[PDB]
Amino acid sequence: AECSVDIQGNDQMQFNTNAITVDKSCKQFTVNLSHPGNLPKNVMGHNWVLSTAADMQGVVTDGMASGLDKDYLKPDDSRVIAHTKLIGSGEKDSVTFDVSKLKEGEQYMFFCTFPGHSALAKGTLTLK
Amino acid sequence: AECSVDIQGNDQMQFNTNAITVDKSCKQFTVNLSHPGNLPKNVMGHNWVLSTAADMQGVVTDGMASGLDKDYLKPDDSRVIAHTKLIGSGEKDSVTFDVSKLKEGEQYMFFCTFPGHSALAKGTLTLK
Amino acid sequence: AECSVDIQGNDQMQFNTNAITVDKSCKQFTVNLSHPGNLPKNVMGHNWVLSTAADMQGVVTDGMASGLDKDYLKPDDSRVIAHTKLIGSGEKDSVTFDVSKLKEGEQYMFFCTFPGHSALAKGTLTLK
Amino acid sequence: AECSVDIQGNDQMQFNTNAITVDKSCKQFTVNLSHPGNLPKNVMGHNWVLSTAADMQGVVTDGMASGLDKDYLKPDDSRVIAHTKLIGSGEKDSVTFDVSKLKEGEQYMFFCTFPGHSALAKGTLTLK
Ligand SMILES: [Cu+2]
Ligand SMILES: [Cu+2]
Ligand SMILES: [Cu+2]
Ligand SMILES: [Cu+2]
DSSP, rough: OOOOEEBBBBBOBBOOOEEEETTTTSSOOOOOOOOOSSSOOOHHHHEEEEEETHHHHHHHHHHHHOOOTTSSSSSOOTSSSSSSSOOOOOOOEEEEEEEGGGGTTTEEEEEEEEEEGGGGEEEEEOOO | OOOOEEEBBOSSSSOOOOOEEEOOOOOOEEEEEEOSSSHHHHHHOOOOOOEEGGGHHHHHHHHHHHHHTTTTSOOOOOTTEEEOOOBBBTTTEEEEEEEGGGGGGGGGEOOSOOOOOOGTEEEEEOOO | OOOEEEEBBBSSBSSSSSEEEETTTTEEEEEEEEEEEOOHHHOOOOOOOEEEEHHHHHHHHHHTOOOOOGGGSSSSOOOEEEEEEHHHHHHEEEEEEEGGGGOSSSSSEEEETTTTTTTTTTEEEEEE | TTTTEEEBBTTOOOOOOOOOEEEESSSSEOOOOOOOOOHHHHOOOOOOOOEEEETTTHHHHHTTTTTGGGTOOTTTTTTTTOOOOOOTTTTTTEEEGGGOOSSSSOOOEEOOOOOTTTSEEEEEEEEE
């Protein structure tokens, strides 16, 4: 709703939304991430990473290899189209990206690369 | 925001929120349920049912035994503090209840009784 | 035992195993799927689909959108190495595939494509 | 078989079984829990906790509130029949409990109380 959306990751390992639609008339899109819980990020940390559906698995695996101090994301990973930092309850982070990076007819997924969170903390994103 | 909350159950079998806090000032609390996907009621129907944490297994068990035709809810189930109807994508329902029916100190859960849905589609609710 | 395995998917959305080793000496491999429970296909159907971990997410998304008549799988989805049928309480289905469809140094996943189940009904398959 | 069982919690948040049968003639029952993968206790610890299916939601909730130094278990929780302690990969722990604490007929669930894991790491236990 407009060119930005507010996403929350909570203490049950879930995102409040599992589907995002990005309007073609948006030059950029902004994702605002908050964490509505009471748990630290060493325990229940969440980021919002975006890649094609096909790349999801790879990013996730490489990322949990990198650890906390690297936000569970592989540095200079060319498959991550856009991402937030990893936060804990009470923290916030936003990222804006170019909608011209996405393309009509490809399937993208967004998820949390923190170990195992991606089973539930994921959702589709489409250019519409 | 105020004495009411908007909950949405989607196609990935989840609620947008897994924690609700009802303020003591509320005379009545309202829940507005929605189904943002595009899957039908028979495949992915969702309801919002409230019971003490203690009663959740029974309501959910007795409920899935009841069937689609009965919104998967034991008719006249006494353990059910409040509930909506089961809806499919595109539909809505609300339920309002007296806060006098809840008590401080007790633990309640809200959940969906459509077969298997309460594993992910559930949450806590407290009178604070 | 041999080049086959017997797997059950219950009314709680769980397969009875998380991992399947496929011995390199088998020419064909056969999975015999059963569904212990009282819930029907349309409500709790279970299939066993196999793909590389990388292709899984897309198989799932595309299958969700295919409908029951299609066993929630996309017709002629080239990413599906093999699959059973969607079966409900009390039914059985088997499938046999050539182990040459499999390469080692590839991670495989098995899962059910029925709406919302893939988060719980999944496991790994390794050509060992 | 007989009076013990060996279960594993992996790095995908899954137990290697979803059902356990406790022979009514065993006088004590021992559960051996190990943790295969590569991740640590704070990112993916697993404990083995047993309670009636009724009491499960409440033990799980009071548990995550208890913190990692309490193994995500409320102490002296009268609802916990038996439990191991939380362990990371590479670890192991056992618990032997008195089969006279169980009653045939009544349903039991075992599960991990680590934040958001019980949704995936859970199963039933029956006295036979
Ligand atoms: Cu996360
Ligand atoms: Cu539901
Ligand atoms: Cu299934
Ligand atoms: Cu665990």
